[PDB]
Amino acid sequence: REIVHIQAGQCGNQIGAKFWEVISDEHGIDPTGSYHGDSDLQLERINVYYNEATGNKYVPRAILVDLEPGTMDSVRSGPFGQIFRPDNFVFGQSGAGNNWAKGHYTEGAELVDSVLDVVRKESESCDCLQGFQLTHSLGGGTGSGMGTLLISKIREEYPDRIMNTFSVMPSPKVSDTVVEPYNATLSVHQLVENTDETYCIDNEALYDICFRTLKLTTPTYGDLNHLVSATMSGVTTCLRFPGQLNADLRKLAVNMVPFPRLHFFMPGFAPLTSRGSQQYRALTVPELTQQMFDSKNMMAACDPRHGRYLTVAAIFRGRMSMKEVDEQMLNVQNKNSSYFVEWIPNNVKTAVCDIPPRGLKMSATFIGNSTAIQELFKRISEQFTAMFRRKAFLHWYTGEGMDEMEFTEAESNMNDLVSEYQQYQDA
């Protein structure tokens, strides 16, 4: 069951690149593609993410896409840059100028077919293709506008494969330009329709976690992206490693998504760590469990106590008692049973994998489908209409073909989405 990875634009390629570093280290694959690991657990499911090349080398099933040659050249120059199959670098030259319209309708249109061709070559190699996972941000133009255009086209060619994204939410605390709320509202409309699973990586939550909890006074994208690679390794654990679960994207979607549009997950991680500095006490299973449910460990700036958990998946990494995991997990439910819906019995599921991630002896990754994610979609809807009620900055988009109407629809679909999350917070 192969997965096809796609990373698009400045942000999607920078986090895209860290993911492949991180998990290439966990599977003992080095920057040349040669395996040098200890456990067989590292290669039993290597094919989910890697293609096996002649000479028994491993090549990520990764398609790298940008409207600009900038970041993508930095990937090729990066530590694992040589691991990526070079034919899979697809890129224009004009850039997308942080403009959703250029990504989706003008500039991205030129380039999308060439991306769809590399996607096709990869899919055909595939034995049983589960689907796709995309890394992008919603606040610029390539990953946001072109990214969702790809997602639309992939779903037309492969209507019955799973579509998974890692979508970075914009935030005034980490913002390139003032049109990010416009770009993200337009994308969120796309995502509600055309993905099975999206992980809401909020840059607001990454920022606070960097500032308040890691005490980083002035956090770079590299600090934010350390958090993003930790969560990304986490949520993909039960797909890359052998365990009792041995999950795939579809079973994941079936059990997490009770209603098709409510497929926006809050990720969470524990222990929160800051790059380089390693602390030396491992956590106790009770600590992982309290921290991982802690709002301070959520990667989407939502208060879980303001919503109800529709469903929950939790993944524990390291040598530890599955008895104490069972006990610590049963205890946080029955302590805070108010915050889980009664009408999906037994909606918290847990898995364990022996291999911990690099640097830590024990770790807990949290995947929550909480109705409190509406707080995110409200935050962005507020910034959206704060400008749109004055039609501010709109010309950047009417200049590339778009109509005011298209904004009213996207705005409207998102307010609908927030109403839908609100319906089940009372049910």
Partner: protein, 68 residues
């Protein structure tokens, strides 16, 4: 339907980039043409009266020949 829309938006951005080069090109030619006529019309007015001055210097000299 979505692709029908996707090509209508890029057709609009072209339509409008074009209508804008058009109306500029035309606004220019209109201005450059109304300007040659105006400036000429003015230089013509100046001469017509500088020459009506020459006709009056004929009439004046032809009067002193009605002296002799």
């Amino acid at each position: 339907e979505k692709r029908e829309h996707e090509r209508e938006v890029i057709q609009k951005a072209i339509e409008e980039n074009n209508n804008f080069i058009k109306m500029a090109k035309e606004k220019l030619a209109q201005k450059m043409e109304s300007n040659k006529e105006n400036r000429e019309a003015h230089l013509a007015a100046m001469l017509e009266r500088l020459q009506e001055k020459d006709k009056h210097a004929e009439e004046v000299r032809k009067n002193k020949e009605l002296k002799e």
